[PDB]
């Protein structure tokens, strides 16, 4: 099932840029059947596809496969890929709070 996670990322300056340290796939203009992380292959949402070792996203607890619902409160469930990318990389914002859902499993079914 999907568990809600609220992640708070503090962007890291790397030269000219403030980076988050992850990659995204998805968006309403992309082919959802190509998403290896979604449960529903018609899900055109924004997904975390990679997370950088030691980057802000990793430290904040973001995980590959996470579905991004909100960025600082902008809905990310029905945006284009570029729109998603732009909301995440606003240089004026050094803190980004993400609402995500995470495919999760009841552990220790036996013990």
């Amino acid at each position: 099932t999907a568990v809600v996670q609220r992640v708070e990322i503090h962007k890291l300056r790397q030269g000219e840029n403030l980076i988050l340290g992850f990659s995204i796939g998805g968006g309403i203009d992309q082919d959802p059947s190509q998403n290896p992380f979604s449960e529903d292959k018609t899900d055109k949402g924004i997904y975390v596809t990679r997370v950088s070792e030691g980057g802000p996203a990793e430290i904040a607890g973001l995980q590959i496969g996470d579905k991004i619902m909100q960025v600082n409160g902008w809905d990310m469930t029905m945006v284009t890929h570029d729109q998603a990318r732009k909301r995440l990389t606003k240089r004026s914002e050094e803190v980004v709070r993400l609402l995500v859902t995470r495919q999760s499993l009841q552990k220790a079914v036996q013990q």
Partner: peptide, 6 residues
Amino acid sequence: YPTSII
């Protein structure tokens, strides 16, 4: 499946 690095 394009991805973007941020």
